[PDB]
Amino acid sequence: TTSSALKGAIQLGITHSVGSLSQKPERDVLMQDFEVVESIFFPSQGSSSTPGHHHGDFKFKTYAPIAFRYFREMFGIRPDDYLYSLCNEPLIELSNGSLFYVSSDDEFIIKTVQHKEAEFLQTLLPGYFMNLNQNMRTLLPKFYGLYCVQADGKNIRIVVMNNLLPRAVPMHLKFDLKGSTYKRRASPKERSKGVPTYKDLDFMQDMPEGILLENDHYTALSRTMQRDCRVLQSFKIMDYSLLVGIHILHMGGIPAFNSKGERLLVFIGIIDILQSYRSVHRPSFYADRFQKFMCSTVFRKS
Amino acid sequence: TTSSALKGAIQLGITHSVGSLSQKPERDVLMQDFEVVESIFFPSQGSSSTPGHHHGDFKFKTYAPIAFRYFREMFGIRPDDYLYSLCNEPLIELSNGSLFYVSSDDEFIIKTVQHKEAEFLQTLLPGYFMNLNQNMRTLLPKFYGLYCVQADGKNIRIVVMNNLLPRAVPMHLKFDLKGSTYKRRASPKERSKGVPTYKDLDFMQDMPEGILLENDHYTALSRTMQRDCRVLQSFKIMDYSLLVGIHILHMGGIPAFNSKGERLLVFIGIIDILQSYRSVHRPSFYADRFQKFMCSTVFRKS
């Protein structure tokens, strides 16, 4: 596998990409900043600029840098913290089209992306920025960066973002949910796992009484969802899932009560947000369903 | 004059336009919201919808409504306060291409606009929004609304915004400044006025020692300028002026000390921001000059 071959390009690349930035001084982000893409050549020899290596000659494309500085900033991600947990610490792979890696400290996920998807996102940024500065408590992904790598002719685009479910809290039940049902059962292979990543039906069978929620916690979530859904819909986006991580216990997550009655810290966040039909009311449709489901069935009041 | 003929269309129009909105419920603003433009027919009879009148049949175009709701909101402009001081209180005209009106309470200015200009601005919005949510203390105009009126075939576009120099503080000296000089003297006609609106040279002759500024006040202004200039520049914008209103005294404005030495509350804000070359470095040029001027010559430290 060209796996650890790539794992390198990333860590060498970012590190240079970000150290690069911390020279250039702070300045508000501008509509222009979004469309930019800065590339950097990595000779296996190494220039007096691009040095080190023994890995596999590649270019390292960095995307909309000033924006992702801004976003990190706004998501409170100190760069050395970023650079560190991300570049000086082996990226551990992951089974789940779409290859996921993880920070050695379970902080950060990396996805790859269909070039269609990167390009979409490039466009999304402004829309993101807006939401971000308005629903401070939105559920959408926290995109810390977008970058691409060149394996000879082959091109790999990737996005770095918040692992929603850090090891730090041991999650008991884990559902990926959609408000849909066809194939929405966790395949056999998946269920042979510790805490496995279930799905709509699994949740419907295994939990039909609900996730109970102290009135005012339900509310926030609900509106906050309905806001995200209104955004997402606006970009003709589909296939998004609410990833939920329930934790029975006997400080980052949401409080809840059980079918039985244990106190619960629950963790959630919408994902898989880059496939957009960029029919006319279809995305509108998939948003209301997601809503009515999560807000009526998955979570419920008192 | 079709003046008071127009003064009506505005006050009848907005009022309907805004009352209209306060039905539709709150929701975050979205990239789409900017491009929208809602029109409303005003028969001199009046529908059961558009009623009243005896003034002159017209349509009332409203621009990017949800954004200007959002902006007002963010500039802290309660609508009834808006609607009131603006619609239920005679708009007083003003001598100064470009017709200015004023709120009966000196809160709000109205300009007209070259359709080129409206169209530019329509595009600017996103860029505005960004700046706005980052330089909270920016100097750019506070655009409370954009609207247009139809006089038969004739079309009038207008923008409502913050009077920078309310009667509430009596301004002694008043300069419109640019960091340029050709014709930058206040014409004779102008000087025959109470406090008149001077200009670069007038300021250079009448005040050459400066406007003195307690270190940390100078700083903010300076960066805040340099931010605005970096925005403005990005939109290939030109002819903008820093409007200054100095007030000798013996709570909204800036503190300062004199050539002599009186305490001073100074009021400022960049204007005339809609003419953009939308040469290649020219706007960049006009920004640095504006900067170096206001920051070296017009204001200076200690």
Ligand SMILES: Nc1ncnc2c1ncn2[C@@H]1O[C@H](COP(=O)(O)OP(=O)(O)NP(=O)(O)O)[C@@H](O)[C@H]1O
């Ligand atoms: N931010 C995240 N935090 C934790 N786990 C994640 C995150 N993103 C993805 N995953 C895991 O990977 C699964 C989702 O992959 P997904 O993001 O839906 O990409 P995909 O490959 O397009 N799958 P599909 O829904 O068929 O399109 C989830 O069920 C999670 O368990």
Ligand SMILES: Nc1ncnc2c1ncn2[C@@H]1O[C@H](COP(=O)(O)OP(=O)(O)NP(=O)(O)O)[C@@H](O)[C@H]1O
């Ligand atoms: N927000 C404001 N507050 C107070 N006065 C204003 C404001 N905007 C404009 N004015 C007054 O009107 C003058 C500027 O008109 P301006 O906005 O420059 O439009 P213009 O008609 O394009 N003039 P020009 O600079 O030749 O293009 C200023 O010197 C002010 O005295």
Ligand SMILES: [Mn+2]
């Ligand atoms: Mn998915």
Ligand SMILES: [Mn+2]
């Ligand atoms: Mn997907």
Ligand SMILES: [Mn+2]
């Ligand atoms: Mn001007």
Ligand SMILES: [Mn+2]
């Ligand atoms: Mn002008």
